[PDB]
Design an enzyme around this catalytic site. Structure first.
Site, short mmCIF file in Angstrom:
data_model
loop_
_atom_site.label_atom_id
_atom_site.label_comp_id
_atom_site.label_asym_id
_atom_site.label_seq_id
_atom_site.Cartn_x
_atom_site.Cartn_y
_atom_site.Cartn_z
N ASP A 1 0.82 -1.21 0.00
CA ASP A 1 0.00 0.00 0.00
C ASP A 1 0.86 1.27 0.00
O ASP A 1 1.40 1.65 1.03
CB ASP A 1 -0.91 -0.01 1.24
CG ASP A 1 -1.85 1.16 1.26
OD1 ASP A 1 -2.02 1.81 0.20
OD2 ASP A 1 -2.43 1.43 2.34
N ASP B 1 -1.43 5.64 -5.25
CA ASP B 1 -1.90 4.80 -4.15
C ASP B 1 -2.23 3.38 -4.62
O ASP B 1 -3.32 3.12 -5.13
CB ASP B 1 -3.14 5.45 -3.52
CG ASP B 1 -3.66 4.70 -2.30
OD1 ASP B 1 -3.11 3.62 -1.97
OD2 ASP B 1 -4.62 5.19 -1.68
C1 LIG Z 1 -18.38 3.10 -4.74
C2 LIG Z 1 -16.91 3.53 -4.86
C3 LIG Z 1 -15.98 2.69 -3.98
C4 LIG Z 1 -14.51 3.13 -4.11
C5 LIG Z 1 -13.55 2.31 -3.24
S1 LIG Z 1 -11.88 2.89 -3.49
O1 LIG Z 1 -11.51 2.62 -4.86
O2 LIG Z 1 -11.75 4.24 -3.02
C6 LIG Z 1 -10.91 1.83 -2.45
C7 LIG Z 1 -10.88 0.44 -2.72
C8 LIG Z 1 -10.10 -0.41 -1.91
C9 LIG Z 1 -9.35 0.12 -0.83
C10 LIG Z 1 -9.37 1.52 -0.55
C11 LIG Z 1 -8.59 2.10 0.55
O3 LIG Z 1 -9.06 2.87 1.40
N1 LIG Z 1 -7.28 1.73 0.57
C12 LIG Z 1 -6.40 1.87 1.74
C13 LIG Z 1 -5.76 0.51 2.09
C14 LIG Z 1 -6.74 -0.64 2.14
C15 LIG Z 1 -6.54 -1.80 1.34
C16 LIG Z 1 -7.46 -2.87 1.38
C17 LIG Z 1 -8.60 -2.80 2.22
C18 LIG Z 1 -8.81 -1.64 3.01
C19 LIG Z 1 -7.89 -0.57 2.97
C20 LIG Z 1 -5.36 2.94 1.38
O4 LIG Z 1 -4.44 3.17 2.42
C21 LIG Z 1 -6.02 4.29 1.04
N2 LIG Z 1 -5.00 5.32 0.95
C22 LIG Z 1 -5.26 6.72 1.35
C23 LIG Z 1 -6.32 7.34 0.42
C24 LIG Z 1 -5.74 6.79 2.83
O5 LIG Z 1 -6.93 6.76 3.15
N3 LIG Z 1 -4.70 6.86 3.69
C25 LIG Z 1 -4.87 6.87 5.15
C26 LIG Z 1 -4.74 8.32 5.66
C27 LIG Z 1 -4.88 8.35 7.23
C28 LIG Z 1 -3.88 7.40 7.94
C29 LIG Z 1 -3.93 5.96 7.35
C30 LIG Z 1 -3.79 5.97 5.80
C31 LIG Z 1 -10.16 2.38 -1.37
#
Ligand SMILES: CCCCCS(=O)(=O)c1cccc(C(=O)N[C@@H](Cc2ccccc2)[C@H](O)CN[C@@H](C)C(=O)NC2CCCCC2)c1
Length: 372
Positions: A32, A215
């Site tokens: 990630d 990302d």
């Molecule tokens: C109907 C639409 C659906 C769309 C789904 S989608 O494609 O967005 C979408 C689809 C799948 C996962 C994610 C998502 O949030 N990814 C995480 C890791 C993760 C991986 C697997 C499962 C759960 C989570 C990243 O880290 C996201 N990265 C930054 C954007 C983030 O949020 N960073 C945080 C900041 C605060 C501290 C911790 C890290 C988004």
């Protein structure tokens, strides 16, 4: 020996094998670049095949500190500690690193995904609880001689994470670099967006409101509301020969065609122009519909090929997720504070169109496209 060391299921993340503890406990870990915590399931969960058992590791050290991490999708809480970590199909080293032992979670682990933890490869600045929790890759570089750089080729799926270097067998043509604007996320600057060659004609700060990041942990290309609405309007116009329910464009509903008959040609190419390393210069990466229409495997619907629209709206800036990274070789050049893109050896494309990374392009408008 690092080539092909990633696996995954479409839309569920790419993971690499790691071991934690002494003796080593093997776990699959999602790669990630969108976060900075290394965390592993450390208690039973319906969707976990296995988990980190701290009581079995002689080298585990409890840090006596809790931690909570919310993602765009899902969240978990856990206990901080440190232990020995290795990557069997990466560099042959062992490092002591911070690990969050996940004891509770919500909508994080995925049924049938085959991973049990997550490797946040971004910078300390977005680590939880705060930036004093050294991220794994930082520990790796500090404790070994591994060069401060890694690259990802995301292609059941597979791919490669090359740690400490660049593997020329994984790409073709030239590597183009865009600066990392700030070391927290892997933040970059988008200077222009075209749909089938037609400029969206927006103030370029809109493309980076309030940031743009690369990302690997996010599935979709996510765009700021204003950019998203303009993009959808243009994609609708290009594909107007067929009409889809609004739920499809919201990324909520599948569209299906009889197996083998997906009308790729009615969907436009998308070009994202990224800031170059030289003033007012840029390069573009071009995405085909084969990338932003994500196949959804389901035996129940397998008389057809069905897809989700893998571009969705964001309130937290642009996210260039897996849909964008697939079919490119992406070099996270931490040492020189830049991200490189090249056409990946594993590209989809058809007999008419091919994803590309190309330049240079020049912009007359001297505006800084960064939001802050
Ligand atoms: C109907 C639409 C659906 C769309 C789904 S989608 O494609 O967005 C979408 C689809 C799948 C996962 C994610 C998502 O949030 N990814 C995480 C890791 C993760 C991986 C697997 C499962 C759960 C989570 C990243 O880290 C996201 N990265 C930054 C954007 C983030 O949020 N960073 C945080 C900041 C605060 C501290 C911790 C890290 C988004």
């Amino acid at each position: 020996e690092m080539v092909d060391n990633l696996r995954g299921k479409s839309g569920q993340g790419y993971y690499v094998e790691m071991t934690v503890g002494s003796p080593p406990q093997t776990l699959n870990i999602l790669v990630d670049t969108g976060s900075s915590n290394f965390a592993v399931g450390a208690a039973p969960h319906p969707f976990l095949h296995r988990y980190y058992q701290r009581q079995l590791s002689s080298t585990y050290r409890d840090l006596r500190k809790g931690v909570y991490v919310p993602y765009t999708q899902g969240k978990w809480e856990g206990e901080l500690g440190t232990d020995l970590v290795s990557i069997p199909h990466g560099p042959q080293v062992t490092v002591r690193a911070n690990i969050a032992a996940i004891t509770e979670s919500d909508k994080f682990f995925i049924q049938g995904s085959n991973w049990e933890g997550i490797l946040g490869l971004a910078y300390a600045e977005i680590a939880r609880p705060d930036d004093s929790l050294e991220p794994f890759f930082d520990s790796l570089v500090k404790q070994t001689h591994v060069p401060n750089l890694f690259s990802l080729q995301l292609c059941s799926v597979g791919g490669s994470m090359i740690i400490g270097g660049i593997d020329h067998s994984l790409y073709t043509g030239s590597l183009w670099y865009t600066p990392i604007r700030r070391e927290w996320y892997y933040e970059v600057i988008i200077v222009r967006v075209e749909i089938n060659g037609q400029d969206l004609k927006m103030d370029c700060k809109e493309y980076n409101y309030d940031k743009s990041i690369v990302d690997s942990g996010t599935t979709n290309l996510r765009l700021p509301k204003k950019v998203f609405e303009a993009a959808v309007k243009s994609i609708k116009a290009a594909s107007s020969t067929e009409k889809f329910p609004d739920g499809f464009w919201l990324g909520e509903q599948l569209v299906c065609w009889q197996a083998g008959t997906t009308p790729w040609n009615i969907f436009p190419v998308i070009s994202l122009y990224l800031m170059g390393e030289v003033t007012q210069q840029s390069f573009r990466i071009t995405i085909l519909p084969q990338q932003y229409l994500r196949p959804v495997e389901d035996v129940a619907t397998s008389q057809d090929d069905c897809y989700k629209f893998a571009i969705s709206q964001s309130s937290t800036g642009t996210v260039m997720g897996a849909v964008i990274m697939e079919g490119f070789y992406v070099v996270f050049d931490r040492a020189r504070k830049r991200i490189g893109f090249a056409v990946s050896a594993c590209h989809v494309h058809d007999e008419f169109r091919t994803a590309a990374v190309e330049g240079p392009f020049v912009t007359l408008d001297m505006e800084d496209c960064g939001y802050n």
